[PDB]
Amino acid sequence: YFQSMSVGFIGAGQLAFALAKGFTAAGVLAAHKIMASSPDMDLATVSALRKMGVKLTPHNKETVQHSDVLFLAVKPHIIPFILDEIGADIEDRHIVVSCAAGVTISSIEKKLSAFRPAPRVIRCMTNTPVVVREGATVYATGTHAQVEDGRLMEQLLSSVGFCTEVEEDLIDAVTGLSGSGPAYAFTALDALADGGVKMGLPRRLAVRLGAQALLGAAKMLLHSEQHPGQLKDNVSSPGGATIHALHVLESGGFRSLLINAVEASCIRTRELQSMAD
Amino acid sequence: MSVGFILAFALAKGFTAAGVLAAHKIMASTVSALRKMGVKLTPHNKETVQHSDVLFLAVKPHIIPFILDEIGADIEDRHIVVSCAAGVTISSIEKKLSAFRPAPRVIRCMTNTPVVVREGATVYATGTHAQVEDGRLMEQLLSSVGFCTEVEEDLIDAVTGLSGSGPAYAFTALDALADGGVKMGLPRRLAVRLGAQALLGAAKMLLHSEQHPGQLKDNVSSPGGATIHALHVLESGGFRSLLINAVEASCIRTRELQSMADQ
Amino acid sequence: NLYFQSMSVGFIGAGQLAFALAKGFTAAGVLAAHKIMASSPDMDLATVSALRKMGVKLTPHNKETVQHSDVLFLAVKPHIIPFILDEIGADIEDRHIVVSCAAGVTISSIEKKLSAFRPAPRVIRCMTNTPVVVREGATVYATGTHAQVEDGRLMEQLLSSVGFCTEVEEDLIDAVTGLSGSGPAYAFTALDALADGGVKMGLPRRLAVRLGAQALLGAAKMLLHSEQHPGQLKDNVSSPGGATIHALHVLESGGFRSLLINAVEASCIRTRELQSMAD
Amino acid sequence: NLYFQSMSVGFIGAGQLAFALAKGFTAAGVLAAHKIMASSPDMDLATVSALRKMGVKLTPHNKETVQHSDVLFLAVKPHIIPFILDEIGADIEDRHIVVSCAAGVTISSIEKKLSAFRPAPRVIRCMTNTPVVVREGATVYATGTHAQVEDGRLMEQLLSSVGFCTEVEEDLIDAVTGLSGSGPAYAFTALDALADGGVKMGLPRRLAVRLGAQALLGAAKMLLHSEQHPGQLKDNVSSPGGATIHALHVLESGGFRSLLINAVEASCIRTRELQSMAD
């Protein structure tokens, strides 16, 4: 559905690389329609992106001039410097998609609006699994984003994962759930593998089994019309190994730790922004 | 090049062991150890400044402003003033010295005691008027006693929490590891030696490896074995979270000390 | 100073420990890579191909390793050792020194198996660790009933080329396993966590890893070159009111010291179990 | 060596600290009991009658203590000190050295009050503890703005007769309060608990109390006469595998060390609050 559209990344780190790789693997954009810029790009990222077909430049202004959709994939405190640098180069045609945690549409529009009125701004929160086209993305549309800009954004990010529109005031909470969530999963998978190794499994097999168990269970829940508590009941046979293991999770307050984590990440996201303003 | 001190012993021993500085090219302002090594010693902090090209400030965060008020009139355009004082900001030094002559060349250093065996961890930040070659000279000199790299000043608190306080974390761990060896039947001297050799060897393995520390943990924990059993008991006590707590607590205290220096 | 540079070394097992020792010995230059042979069941291991790239001879036949070797290291999971000793017992010759690195496996259990084939097998029990790969291992050994005096000296000379090495009574080896055998894994865990702490406080992860590892290496070296107690070095570096003593307090409040005692004890007890489960 | 045996000493307050110092001074023989006067609101205290039996002069009038004294100790609850200084400020003479043992009460707050009456009051701030009663106190002092050089020496000579004594900067006294000021109560608590442990394991309570107190006295003396770190002495006395290292493990698992850090900190912070609540 995207024939001539070109995409740019300001930033070439973990998230920009994941999105660019997922977009190209999706085939929704020709790789040569993608440009990425950063001032000191790691030579291994240069090599991988070049082999992918992505165009590269140190000059953010070239990315702006190449792009129709412009992703801001720098650290949150870098956003206002970027907006000052490129603000005079924003055109009517641009959609500016901020991926930065915490950074409000309001703050981006106030910077850009000093240069040309009505910047079209979308704020999104995604996660690194876009790199395997299983990301979880939400976006909120800015004051001057045309209704079709949101639709275009959704169609584009839907090619690398789940994607849905939210009110901007949910994004910090999403950040604490699906933005940080992969790190919770990787922590859990490392520990589950340690557990399998303690009970006699080779590490390589433990890592594989644990990751496959998690992927399968998550897919079961997504494809099920059932409450996760009901799936827990379905697979916990009376007197069995699983309900014994669930008891030891409950005794250490397992559930409360995950709630603590979502809360901690969301709150930190709010604090950082309140320091930015 | 001449170097002066006003952690002081550790760097002078490390420098001289490195052969980067002759001992006598170094004046100071513990005394029998320095005099033995060949280090000139003087009580009058003013003599140290007149003698030196690169001037280290190794005094408590409380004794820096009084050191600067004393020797401020004596700083020349040639000097590089390198501050290792915990929590003393570049701003508070420049502010004091600028009253005497403008554009003082100031570098803030965050190093640790293992420079004394030339295995320190050092970062430095360059001040307003430090020329580019001043920071290159600093890196070259401090690289002779360990790792050295440049950082922004606003990361020195974090570095303090990690490699600044780090050796104390390790000394604590080695004392406890030795208590464990002794509980299980080892003589104390053997337990201390083995535990310290295990930490050094593991740190070197990581430093020479292109591998994540978790990957090295994976590689050495055989299935069902003694090591994975022991890792589990570490995990059940929240071992990892305590070390995060420590880096955080030391970094945060350093920010409080920077606040006092800036007031 | 015994001459051993021309002798042949075999490993039964081609895993992490065999790789580590073979790498350390060849990097020390004390043995030629073609003097080393290793046998293993599974060849599609990363360690089998690493041995191959070093120039070590690889084979699936344990007898061939035994016939090649003068010094024979046993570096397989413990419960495997009786099946190995049954398989190769008839191939042990008078020239062989058998060096068991199998954790928990006692000299007695080895000598009992091997004695059924030839009397007076020369056996040495070894406890070492993976940092021999960077020539900073921590190794202890105990000599068996028929080990000659020069066997112990040869073992000490060889293993000193890749780190600290000293003779102990056999009844210490289980505690050594809990301390320096498992010790590197405690250190890797600590370094991961310290780097997470550095990242929490604003450092890039690569720098935090480097700084934390350098801090631990340097502190460990300081202690080894000091004649001082680790508590004295802790005292010497903790300035009044400063950042370090504040961090040490939060370590103490979580019982940091007790966790490391708990770990040494747990590893040592598990090592004792593994022997008892064998016997 | 200053001569002070004939001088007169007053205490405003007749509580535990006044009793302890008066007892310690008289037991050291450095002052005559009739040279000491103490004033207090309530006379039906056990400490008032103990002072009486020692031969100390007791009175309800703080002015009379001031007129009697050359050295004047303030040993009342802190919030009382401003009302005392208002009451007796006009009676301070040039001969007086005022020695405040009120915890937290700063030299500044005292000098400000007393300066309204006569300029240059000679003030010393003291932090001591109850074991001066057995001449084993731990005392520090800081000299005020108008304290002569000999005032500090006189104070050190006097307080050294009842224990350790040294001069400090005033900004250490709050931390000293948390450590050796409160320290005896930590020790009494520990001794009660250790004796309960002895009773649990079969000892009669009287013996357990004696053995535990003697163990602590002896260990403390060993440390003071050693040039060694307490961790080194801990190492020296903990035999491998033995009873002591097993007990030290259970101490560590409850975070014993952190509780004592917590206590010093809590006492020091409370002392800082009490000054701030005053100011």
Place this chain on the structure above:
Amino acid sequence: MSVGFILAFALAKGFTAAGVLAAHKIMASTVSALRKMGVKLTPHNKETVQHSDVLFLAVKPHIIPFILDEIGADIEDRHIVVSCAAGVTISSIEKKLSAFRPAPRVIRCMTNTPVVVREGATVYATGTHAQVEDGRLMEQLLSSVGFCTEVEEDLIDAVTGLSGSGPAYAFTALDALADGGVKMGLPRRLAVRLGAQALLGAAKMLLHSEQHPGQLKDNVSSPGGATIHALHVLESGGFRSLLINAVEASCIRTRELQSMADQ
């Protein structure tokens, strides 16, 4: 009277400092310290027995049976064999020695390192053939380096848990107290001195007092004050229960060691 050793240094230093024994009347089987004090030294454990009247065994619980098998033929009717070896029961000593001559006079001692400054805590139990005057002589000799009293042998495990391990508890407490002093701003050397002086003074106050330790706690905790605030934080961590745990753990380990000696 002649005394021999085969904790050994601590008693010999304490005895000689006490003037109860001339240094040369003592033979032993750390070496420069003893030789300096005037203590005869010999490698051959047999020479020590021939020299001595009262014979101390200061070796690991593991090295006692081999010491007894060595010198057993040399024990005479005059000897009192005093064992300080941790966990070695009177029964296991008498059993070994009785093979050589019947009725060996054996005393089991539980003392601690502060005998080196003559403030030890010692209990002793008399063996099957120890005459009444043997235990009186023991009490008189050990009273010169600290407290000494007789107990039943089945209380020595408890005493071990309390005053045997006690000094290690105190060294640990003094290190932590000093960390606390340092955290709050004190120099380390001052913090160590003050904390040790506070413990010594408090222990002496209790020893000289006719008062319960809780009464002394009450007497020194002023209402609302710094001390009662600090006691509360001790209570919230279960401080008292940890010390009970410690005495129990050391006593129980001593019973396990007695079981090994008796097997």
